[PDB]
Amino acid sequence: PPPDEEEQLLAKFVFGDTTDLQENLAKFNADF
Amino acid sequence: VLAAKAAVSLRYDALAEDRDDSGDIGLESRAKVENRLSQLEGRDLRTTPK
């Protein structure tokens, strides 16, 4: 019984999840 | 500086029988007056430390 991503998508806003947000913080270097 | 160049400009206008009537000598003056102004604001009376 896994979560989906769309229940994870409201969990990511509701649980205060920053790990995906830290991923996008750590994602990019010289993107052009 | 303007009152200087005014004497150079007015007498270019009041005392020239052949005349372009086109404002060049006044603009030749105003370019240098603006350049004195731009050199003058370039200076600063403060202390600029390194």
Add this chain to the structure above:
Amino acid sequence: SSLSDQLAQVASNNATVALDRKRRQKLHSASLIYNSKTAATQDYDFIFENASKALEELSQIEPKFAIFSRTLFSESSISLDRNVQTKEEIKDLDNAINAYLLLASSKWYLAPTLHATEWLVRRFQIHVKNTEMLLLSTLNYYQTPVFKRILSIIKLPPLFNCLSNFVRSEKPPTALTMIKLFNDMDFLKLYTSYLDQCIKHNATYTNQLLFTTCCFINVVAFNSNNDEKLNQLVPILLEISAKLLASKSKDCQIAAHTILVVFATALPLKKTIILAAMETILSNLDAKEAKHSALLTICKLFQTLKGQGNVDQLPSKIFKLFDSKFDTVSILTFLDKEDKPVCDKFITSYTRSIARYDRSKLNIILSLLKKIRLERYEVRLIITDLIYLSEILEDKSQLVELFEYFISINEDLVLKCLKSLGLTGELFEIR
């Protein structure tokens, strides 16, 4: 050290971490538009909604700012303060902030940029936490009062120390302060680290770039006497010129061109360094608008030097690169300009390089040599190599018209070098 200085250092370690509530009403109350009584009473969410309200218009101007909505202007990116993060996370935060700063450096006349970066000032303390990129991305706007506001808010680093009298000032910082800011050496290592960062990221726009060349050029203006300070100033400017020419951009090309022009005209480099300059200039001369500048660069460049081998022929790689990026008839058009700028030391050096590798277009040389009144030794030094191509290259009618022109103009000069090399009647026995 003293205790007090060892403890005021811990102020610098925690200048943004507000512990007492007065430290919050100091640390939150400074921002880019709002007065500090109204800036004191701003909720984070209220500032972020204005941040997105400017950021959406910015992202719609160009899509490259859309990615900071994914990370920096995320709705989840409100509660996170910097000091709660690890330094390895803080490095990526600074990476995002820096890449945003050189990006918005172009768009800074817009009140969208002022309303967007003010939240970043207030959410990430970038007036204090990363102020070197804040100032280096926004250094050219020194007349604009948005920057003048920014000066009253930035914790000034030691590298930007000319403006220690200009934080919380009325009148804007003057043009001479930009030179005295740039007249330091290690400041220039920061400006390389800015411009080289903008080159690989290809975020290089014209107005700031013109301010770059006007500052670097004024540095070599200020170092016209300090030749030893100039000799430690070659590594900082010629690196910026070289890495500038690796750009696709053409304004960057003419920027590096101005750098090389004013640098060679202020300090005579070695000839081989000017050959390196020619290789880097011509090896990226692609677009049209840089060619008119770049021709005058070499026109200045070969005039800036003097020595043994002053007008010697170019290397075959250099000459073939030059005759790829220009034609013959490019210079045949250019020498017949009414501006007619003095490329005197270049033509007499380049015709020899025609006369050794190519030798196919000396009618072109006849056209070339009637165009410009050259220098005295120069024409003689061309005529010696043409004596060499009389002797070893098989004699042809192009060279006959060449030397008939050279008897029409300065026959006695030909007589003197012929008394130096060969004989006179033997030159009649040539053709």
